[PDB]
Design an enzyme around this catalytic site. Structure first.
Site, PDB file in Angstrom:
ATOM      1  N   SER A 107     -16.283  -3.949  -7.222  1.00  0.00           N
ATOM      2  CA  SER A 107     -15.681  -2.502  -7.416  1.00  0.00           C
ATOM      3  C   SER A 107     -15.730  -1.692  -8.701  1.00  0.00           C
ATOM      4  O   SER A 107     -15.721  -1.754  -9.369  1.00  0.00           O
ATOM      5  CB  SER A 107     -14.704  -2.661  -6.765  1.00  0.00           C
ATOM      6  OG  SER A 107     -14.630  -3.230  -5.355  1.00  0.00           O
ATOM      7  N   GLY A 108     -15.658   0.137  -8.782  1.00  0.00           N
ATOM      8  CA  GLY A 108     -16.119   0.928  -9.310  1.00  0.00           C
ATOM      9  C   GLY A 108     -17.548   1.036 -10.495  1.00  0.00           C
ATOM     10  O   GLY A 108     -17.194   1.622 -11.105  1.00  0.00           O
ATOM     11  N   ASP A 128     -11.090   6.565  -4.133  1.00  0.00           N
ATOM     12  CA  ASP A 128     -10.760   5.630  -4.451  1.00  0.00           C
ATOM     13  C   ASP A 128     -11.269   6.059  -5.654  1.00  0.00           C
ATOM     14  O   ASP A 128     -12.348   5.638  -6.056  1.00  0.00           O
ATOM     15  CB  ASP A 128     -11.529   4.592  -3.979  1.00  0.00           C
ATOM     16  CG  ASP A 128     -11.638   3.326  -4.740  1.00  0.00           C
ATOM     17  OD1 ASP A 128     -10.938   3.240  -5.019  1.00  0.00           O
ATOM     18  OD2 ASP A 128     -11.956   2.376  -3.950  1.00  0.00           O
ATOM     19  N   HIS A 152      -9.156   1.124  -6.747  1.00  0.00           N
ATOM     20  CA  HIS A 152      -8.150   0.134  -6.556  1.00  0.00           C
ATOM     21  C   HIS A 152      -8.178  -1.078  -7.419  1.00  0.00           C
ATOM     22  O   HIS A 152      -8.249  -2.292  -7.067  1.00  0.00           O
ATOM     23  CB  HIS A 152      -8.951  -0.673  -5.179  1.00  0.00           C
ATOM     24  CG  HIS A 152     -10.078  -0.959  -4.917  1.00  0.00           C
ATOM     25  ND1 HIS A 152     -11.133   0.370  -5.136  1.00  0.00           N
ATOM     26  CD2 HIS A 152     -10.940  -1.941  -5.291  1.00  0.00           C
ATOM     27  CE1 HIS A 152     -12.691  -0.808  -4.943  1.00  0.00           C
ATOM     28  NE2 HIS A 152     -12.026  -1.877  -4.686  1.00  0.00           N
TER      29      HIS A 152
END
Ligand SMILES: [Mg+2]
Length: 221
Positions: free
Chosen positions: A176-177, A85, A41
């Site tokens: 995120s990530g 993801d 994402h």
């Protein structure tokens, strides 16, 4: 990352910062001189990758920038459920290593018993603001049974839960990530979770990295 604190400057050589339009969008993990692993994402056009960063408001002698020549999003990524993801980013040129820039090995064994792990990132902090200095926090892996209990019918085999019942330390928007590190190996990637951020009741959900050893290996090869 909420309820944590500033990381030690030399404890995150594998941490990458992903930028777009001049602003940090996500964290990422250097897993090979030419590859940064992150969440699917975090895909945006013209991503900029920064390695060797600690404080975003200070020009650091160890920081290195890089453009992305190719992004490989998992073929089965689902942006609704967050399933699979994961995305690999190939750097224009191999990263220059030092004490502040190093790759992080992947956890190949899904049954690894190291439960005490830690997360890090420049994502939103408890005060609702975004920090200049990268934040760190130790959390624990949560059994799939408890994971599924917290998020009934939303947890797949490609996800792993982790949180902190004491202070609710948790990853947040912007993290995120980023990496979920357990026993010096990458166990997961910041994917989704409770909003507002906090993991006392609802644990953070991370991409189950051990499940992608084959896919990543095949992709880098
Ligand atoms: Mg699908």
């Amino acid at each position: 990352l909420v309820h944590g604190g500033p990381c030690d400057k030399t404890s995150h050589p594998y941490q990458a910062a992903l930028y777009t339009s001049g602003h940090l969008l996500c964290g990422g993990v250097l897993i090979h001189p030419l590859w940064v692993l992150t969440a699917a994402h975090c895909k945006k056009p013209n991503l900029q990758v920064f390695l060797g960063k600690h404080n975003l408001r200070q020009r650091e002698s160890s920081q290195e920038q890089s453009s992305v020549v190719r992004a490989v999003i998992h073929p089965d990524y689902d942006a609704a459920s967050h399933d699979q993801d994961i995305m690999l980013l190939r750097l224009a040129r191999p990263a220059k290593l030092s004490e502040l820039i190093q790759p992080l090995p992947l956890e190949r064994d899904c049954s690894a018993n190291t439960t005490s792990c830690h997360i890090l990132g420049w994502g939103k902090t408890a005060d609702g603001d975004f920090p200049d200095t990268i934040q760190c926090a130790y959390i624990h892996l949560v059994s799939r049974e408890e994971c599924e209990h917290a998020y009934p019918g939303q947890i797949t085999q490609n996800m792993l839960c982790a949180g902190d019942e004491k202070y609710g330390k948790d990853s947040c928007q912007g993290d995120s990530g980023g990496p979920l590190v357990c026993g010096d190996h990458l166990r997961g990637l910041v994917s989704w979770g409770n909003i507002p951020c906090g993991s006392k009741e609802k644990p953070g959900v991370y991409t189950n990295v051990c499940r992608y050893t084959n896919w990543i290996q095949k992709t880098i090869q």
